């Protein structure tokens, strides 16, 4: 995993397109090189180690682009996590106050999160095999396993989205309807992070109370996502973010 | 910056977005047209009725935050607003809730919009 | 030796820097393309023989 982070910028701001052609060329030559553009004006390079970045900038400055470039000093990329279970519900009802989502969060135990990263328990399983794995491996509850909704940031991410609100959980109609954008907002909040805007790691989210607009029309459809995101961030923050 | 007028270049009391892209507070821009039918953004003379409003939320501290994502606005943030709406959101939320979907409506209300009605008033990448 | 040859910047903003360990001349020489702006006529040392 490339964790070392290096920001790059030309000396004469006139020279930005040539630099961008350079960054393309180096992306073509290097298999794991990651490049990004940070909103705050930075073209950022992600690599694995000092020698790796040295030879990247060698190929950049000498052969692909003979433009003159300043280079910021390296840093690492961080993750964000929690140590503890959320203490109260912060809960978002969409702009038109039609759907309310209460959801709280907690830290995952290493074993699972590393298993999810290892793809041991890939969610392309059916719920049966998921529950088998889970109840067996981590003293997991079985209704919990049936409640295991998603894994978040992308196809495999250390985070885990699980809903537990039984009697109204038997509103599986509008639930089963909106769960898609619910998980879309989950994925967004998890890729985007509250603290540093860095990928969050090793977190469990539990949707505990979902009020849904009857016939959750475009109201629910569009407006629910940012609501779900604020829900994620608010639980996370509310009881105990960490780097 | 975001919250600064252009005829004055100091903090803006009631923002009134020009259809071209320059915000300018009407508490100033009224007299500028009453004495010169041209705007300061371009000495080419222009309409006054074209002035759209702009409605900027505030947080527990009152800072002008975007509506949907609650991100406190800074001097690098890209801020686009819906001319058909009058409310200002972050370019990220406006796009990836109206670019990922096809629903070129409003996000604060259900107001449908024209996909040409988003004006991006401040974006460092330009 | 004598120096071979002899404005504003936005990176250098010190409020943005994370200073853990002070960058020394050994580092700037070991990795002359990563710790160095304007490297001209720089030979690349490395060996692990």
């Amino acid at each position: 995993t490339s964790v070392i982070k290096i920001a790059v910028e030309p000396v004469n701001p006139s020279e930005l397109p040539k630099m961008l052609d350079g960054l393309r060329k180096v992306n073509k030559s290097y298999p794991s090189l990651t490049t990004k553009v940070e909103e705050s004006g930075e073209h950022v390079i992600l690599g694995t180690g000092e020698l790796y970045l040295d030879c990247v900038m060698h190929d950049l400055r000498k052969m692909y682009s003979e433009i003159d470039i300043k280079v910021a000093d390296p840093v690492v990329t961080f993750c964000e996590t929690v140590v503890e279970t959320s203490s109260l519900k912060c809960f978002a009802e969409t702009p038109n106050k039609k759907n309310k989502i209460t959801m709280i969060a907690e830290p995952l135990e290493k074993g699972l999160a590393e298993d999810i990263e290892n793809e041991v328990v890939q969610i392309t399983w059916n719920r049966k095999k998921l529950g088998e794995f889970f109840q067996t491996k981590y003293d997991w509850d079985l209704l919990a396993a049936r409640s295991i909704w998603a894994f978040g940031p992308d196809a495999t991410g250390p985070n885990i989205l699980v809903d537990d609100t039984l009697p109204s959980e038997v509103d599986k109609a509008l639930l089963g309807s909106v769960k898609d954008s619910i998980v879309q907002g989950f994925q967004w909040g998890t890729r985007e992070g509250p603290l540093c805007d860095e990928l969050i790691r090793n977190v469990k989210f539990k949707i505990l109370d979902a009020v849904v607009a009857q016939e959750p029309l475009h109201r629910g459809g569009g407006q629910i996502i940012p609501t779900a995101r604020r829900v994620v961030y608010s639980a996370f923050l509310m009881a105990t973010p960490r780097l | 910056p975001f919250d600064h007028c252009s005829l004055s270049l100091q903090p803006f009391v009631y923002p009134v977005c020009t259809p071209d892209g320059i915000v300018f507070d009407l508490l100033n821009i009224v007299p500028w047209l009453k004495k010169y039918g041209t705007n300061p953004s371009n000495g080419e003379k222009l309409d006054g009725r074209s002035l759209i409003k702009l409605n900027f939320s505030k947080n527990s501290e009152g800072k002008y935050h975007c509506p949907v994502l609650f991100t406190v606005f800074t001097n690098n943030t890209h801020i686009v607003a819906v001319r058909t709406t009058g409310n200002v959101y972050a370019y990220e939320a406006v796009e990836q809730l109206n670019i990922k979907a096809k629903n070129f409506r409003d996000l604060l209300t259900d107001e449908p919009f024209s996909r040409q009605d988003i004006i991006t008033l401040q974006d460092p990448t330009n | 030796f004598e120096p071979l040859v002899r404005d504003w910047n936005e990176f250098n903003d010190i409020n943005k820097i994370i200073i853990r360990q002070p960058i020394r001349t050994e580092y700037k020489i070991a990795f002359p393309y990563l710790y160095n702006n304007l490297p001209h006529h720089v030979h690349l040392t490395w060996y692990h023989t």
């Binding site: 940070e38 909103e39 705050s40 930075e42 840093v75 961080f78 603290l195 540093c196 805007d197 860095e198 960490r242 780097l243 | 406190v72 800074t74 001097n75 690098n76 943030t77 | 409020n15 943005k16 820097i17 994370i18």
Partner: peptide
Amino acid sequence: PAPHLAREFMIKTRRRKGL
């Protein structure tokens, strides 16, 4: 010193990009 590298890193990263 040790107790506050997290405060320092988050502040610096936000002043760098996130504001």
